[PDB]
DNA sequence: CGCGCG
DNA sequence: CGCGCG
């Protein structure tokens, strides 16, 4: 909920592929918690994966 | 024995490859745990995985 | 080592 | 859907 506004907000702000790692430092939650919105973002195509790791805005 | 001696035991008495599935009826422990000890037991050559998701001693 | 797995 | 991941 909350966490996908700030997943959203930090791939908006950048506007290109971000690496998982920086949304761990950025989030303050661990992979697992963002992968699983991430995924399910991606399903929903809000989100794209360019490459492994990657997450960039729009799908 | 965390789990090892049994996962060991089971495979020994089988002499064969035994599905991860046979081996969570036998344990009665989850797939995860298995998994842990089985890829643990692999990489100290003391199991192998002929095909995925099949062991067998060795 | 990519892993999200329900 | 293989997943073990430390």
């Known amino acids: 909920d909350n966490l996908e506004q700030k997943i ?3 791939l908006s ?3 290109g592929p971000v690496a998982i790692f920086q949304l ?5 939650v ?3 918690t963002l992968n ?3 995924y399910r973002l991606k399903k929903e195509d809000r989100v794209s994966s360019p490459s492994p ?3 960039s805005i729009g799908g």
């Open 30 to 32: 661990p992979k697992k």
């Open 24 to 28: 761990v430092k950025k989030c303050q």
């Open 13 to 15: 702000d950048d506007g």
């Open 53 to 55: 790791k990657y997450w």
């Open 36 to 38: 699983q919105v991430l």
């Open 8 to 10: 959203l907000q930090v």
